Each structure stands twice: as C-alpha cells, then as structure tokens.
C-alpha cells in the first residue's frame, strides 16, 4: 500500500508520502 495517486498515468501522478 503506497501513497501514490493516478499512478496509471505517469504524468498525472501525485505522491503523498513513503510507501507502506
């Protein structure tokens, strides 16, 4: 469980924090 959003879109992705 990571903290990535819109991962399926390598350009629209927003990373909130460290995974797990």
């Amino acid at each position, epitope marked *: 469980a990571c903290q990535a*959003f819109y991962a399926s879109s390598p*350009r*629209k*992705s*927003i*990373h*909130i*924090g*460290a*995974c797990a």
Partner: antibody, heavy 124, light 117 residues
Framework: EVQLVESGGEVKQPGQSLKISCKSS????????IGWVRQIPGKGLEWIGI????????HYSPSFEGQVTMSVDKSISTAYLQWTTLQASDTGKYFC?????????????????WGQGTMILVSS | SYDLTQPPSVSVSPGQTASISCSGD??????VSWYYQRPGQSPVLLMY???KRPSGIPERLSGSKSGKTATLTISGTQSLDEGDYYC???????????????????FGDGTRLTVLG
C-alpha cells in the same frame, strides 16, 4: 523561459461575478496540475484547489467547493478561476502555480512554478 | 484535513543557525515541502519530499523530519533569508461511497524569519 502570467488585478463590489486567468508557457500545459492559492493581506497561504488541464480533473478545498470554479482552456494554455457572486471575504492576492512531478527512486510533487499573483479587492 | 503548526516568528543574528519547525498529526507518513516568500513577492520552492532541495537552492538550507515534525534548518543565516516560510503536505480520503478520492493541499500558517541587522 517557463512561466505563468496571471491577469491584472481588479476591484469589484459585493455580488459581482469574476473570472481571473493564468497563461503558462515553456512547458506542456496539459501535463502538470495547476493549483490555486489565496493570500489575504497579512495572512498566510490558503489552498483553493488543483486542476489537471488535460482532463480538467479537480480537487477543491472544502472551503471553496461550490464557491469558486476552476477550469482551463487547452487551446490557449490558460487556467481560470471564477466566482458568480463575490464577497468581501474574497479580497486577497491569488496565485497560480504548477505542481511539479519529481521522478526518481521515490517520486514526489511540489509547487515549483508560480505566477506573479492577481490582487482582488472586493469593496463597496 | 489535519493542521500544520509552525511558529509565526523566529529571530536570529547573521551567521547564526536558524530553525523552523512544523508539525501536524499525519506528518509521520506524509512528505513535507518548504516555500519561501519575500513580502509582496511570489512563493519560492526550497525543499520537497522532506529533504530534497531544488537545483539552485543553497546547501545551507537543510530539510529534516522526525516523528510528526518537519524541520527547516538554515545554517549561517545571511540576510536575504529574511522573509516568510511555509511548510506544506497532503492528505487523502478515499470516500466510503465506493469510488472517489479526495486530495488535500495543506499549508502551515508560516514563519516570519527575522535577521537582526
């Protein structure tokens, strides 16, 4: 170089509608989220929301959702922010900023590019 | 939707090391970014993902984290360092309505760094 140029400041009266703009240049407009931040005189930075120009997906701060509307015009690389009804509490400097995606070991995002801001005075 | 707390004021003498704290309840699992703003100017990105500083930012600016606190340490504080400082993070809330996730940008109230000149 790459930059965001915001529309000029204005003075409106309570009840009026308003639409301010932000034109980017030097990078692919559709590929980076555009956020909007407010800053009332003396106060700190308040978040209004973010919108992705390619499909206009948006996230609004619970405080502004329904009070303001974010949107972009792809054909001219411009993000907008509008009100149908202005209030005195809307007074302040509005910044337009691009959220940059830092790709690496573990990717992250931060607002690297900012507009010069659009001062808006709502007064009688 | 949690709060980000930072001292509205921090004062220091030229050359001294200045420290700007910022804490929030979820900062233990959230990246923090720091911005700088000279009165009447536009914000400037200084740090992102807790300790990574954008190209062009002085090495004297170090970004740290520990528990629910994030810290921006400025060693050898010059005077162009004078200004406001904001920390920021995010929050996500996958709605229980099946689909739909809300993202949130959070800002601290800011710290006014004063260089007694």
């Amino acid at each position: 170089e790459v930059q965001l140029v915001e529309s000029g400041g204005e003075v409106k009266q309570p009840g009026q509608s308003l639409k301010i703009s932000c034109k980017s240049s030097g990078y692919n407009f559709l590929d980076s989220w555009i956020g909007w931040v407010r800053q009332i005189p003396g106060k700190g930075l308040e978040w209004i929301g973010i919108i992705y120009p390619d499909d206009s997906d948006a996230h609004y701060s619970p405080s502004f959702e329904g009070q303001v509307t974010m949107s972009v015009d792809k054909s001219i690389s411009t993000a907008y922010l509008q009100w149908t009804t202005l209030q005195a509490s809307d007074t302040g400097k509005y910044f337009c900023t691009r959220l940059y995606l830092f790709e690496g070991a573990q990717s992250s995002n931060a607002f690297d590019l900012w507009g010069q801001g659009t001062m808006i005075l709502v007064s009688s | 939707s949690y709060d980000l707390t930072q001292p509205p004021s921090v004062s220091v003498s030229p050359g001294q090391t200045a420290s700007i704290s910022c804490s929030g309840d979820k900062l233990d699992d959230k990246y923090v970014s720091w911005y700088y703003q000279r009165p009447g100017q536009s914000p400037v990105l200084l740090m992102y993902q807790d300790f990574k500083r954008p190209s062009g930012i002085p090495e004297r600016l170090s970004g740290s984290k520990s528990g629910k606190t994030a810290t921006l340490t400025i060693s050898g504080t010059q005077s162009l360092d004078e200004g406001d400082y904001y920390c920021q993070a995010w929050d996500a809330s996958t709605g229980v309505s099946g689909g739909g996730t809300k993202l949130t940008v959070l800002f601290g109230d800011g710290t006014r760094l004063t260089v007694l000149g």
